[PDB]
């Protein structure tokens, strides 16, 4: 019932790669999907992380584990990334949230030095 | 009819401490839920007994809007079957819960530099809170064997405890405003409908 | 639907304490949530008081009463203080969406 997103902070020089992880802890409920959002440093609106050459989104469904990997880091990627997990319809279970219920991760502040 | 006044609950200038949580009845209005659901301002949007994607197609005999302030580490407790200091002593959802739990980070509003200690929560109670019950009393909790004549001291604690909300806190100790909508469907004409 | 604030005017010196008491009356609901507002002496607005440090609030639910005690009085404490009892709770018959304020307490702390 909690999205544990790690790391909370990361700083890397321009060129290398990084990976953001967020997993659901202590859950018996089906998950439908998970989206990734980025709020650039200085903005207040989030952008959906769509298809990208340098973006890789990985899902381990049975693990309730979701990861985002960004290769060839640039300063344009500096900001805060959040994962947004969506719940599926877990049949015959009162304690599970309905289909479409969501929870955001705590967030990840990433800094890329030029 | 007219739209339900969700704003006067979500956008209230001041929120209450979880032990004195607020409750406003929503009645005789059209309820637009996808405005809340399709938003980027809410950290948690979990509905129970009903999918949020179907809320605008359903009517209800009565809708209650409950609002309070807790810390992020305790948002998990606002859910059916959960236990903890808040669920047991402050705000308890029933196991047969049908409704939605909506929460968002309110660090910019409810945190002061040097700490905001104005939001309280009940730390001690004799028995666990019944579902949707609210406890207002401030009587000294009889902790140990020796009774208490309204005096705070040894084995005599004040039942309420303050949060320390500071901007420099981790997200687990940052303040979260929570709105829980509880839906009731009886064999009677429904008062709240979606479009 | 109105709280009575006492006293109306008290004066102290630097150092000592003071206590403003407030009782909620003419209502069927309990005393749920409260606030204390302060208007500085030569000021035009009221500031929300932060509880838990110098400002100590005692709340008694049985007597529908609540008080504020202030210590370490400095000359900057001169002003007016007001209570505020408010709640938004609704049940089958008992309803209370009230937001009431006190008559005020003009305090005057003297210099060293
Ligand atoms: C609470 O207030 C917010 C902001 O005042 C409302 O959402 C905004 O609505 C205006 C009007 O279109 C837009 O300019 C903003 O972009 C909206 N912001 C968001 C985050 O949606 C919100 O509707 C109010 N709450 C309720 C329940 O109505």
Residue numbers in the entry:
A (entry chain A): 1 to 114
B (entry chain C): 333 to 527
C (entry chain B): 1 to 112
Direct quotes from the study:
Here we show that nurse sharks immunized with SARS-CoV-2 recombinant receptor binding domain (RBD), RBD-ferritin (RFN), or spike protein ferritin nanoparticle (SpFN) immunogens elicit a set of new antigen receptor antibody (IgNAR) molecules that target two non-overlapping conserved epitopes on the spike RBD. The variable binding domains of these antibodies, VNARs, are the smallest known natural nanobodies. Despite their small size, VNARs are capable of generating a wide paratope repertoire due to their complementarity-determining region 3 (CDR3) recombination process where two or more D segments are combined. Representative shark antibody variable NAR-Fc chimeras (ShAbs) targeting either of the two epitopes mediate cell-effector functions, with high affinity to all SARS-CoV-2 viral variants of concern, including the divergent Omicron strains.
We determined the crystal structure of SARS-CoV-2 WA-1 RBD in complex with ShAb01 and ShAb02 VNARs at a resolution of 2.5 Å by X-ray crystallography. The structures of ShAb01 and ShAb02 show that they are both VNARs with typical β-sheet topology and an extensive RBD-contacting interface. ShAb01 binds to the RBD with a total buried surface area (BSA) of 888.5 Å2 primarily engaging the CDR3 loop (728.5 Å2) and the first β-sheet recognizing one side of the SARS-CoV-2 RBD, reminiscent of CR3022 binding and distal from the ACE2 binding site. Within the CDR3 loop, a β-sheet (G100-E104) forms an anti-parallel interaction with an RBD β-sheet (S375-S379), and the CDR3 tip (Y86-G100) interacts with multiple loops of the RBD including Y369-A372, F374-T385, A411-Q414, and D427-F429. In addition, the N-terminal residues of ShAb01 bind to a pocket located between RBD residues D405-A411 and β-sheet S375-Y380 thus increasing the overall ShAb01-RBD interaction. ShAb02 binds to the opposite face of the SARS-CoV-2 RBD in relation to the ShAb01 epitope. ShAb02 forms multiple interactions with the RBD using CDR1 (151.5 Å2), HV2 (146.5 Å2), and CDR3 (533 Å2) with a total BSA interface of 905 Å2. The major contact region between ShAb02 and RBD is facilitated through four negatively charged residues of the ShAb02 CDR3 loop. Notably, the SARS-CoV-2 RBD R346 forms a hydrogen bond with ShAb02 Y101, a salt bridge with ShAb02 D99, and pi-pi interactions with ShAb02 W86. RBD residues N354 and K356 insert into a structural groove formed by two ShAb02 CDR3 β-sheets to create extensive buried surface interaction.
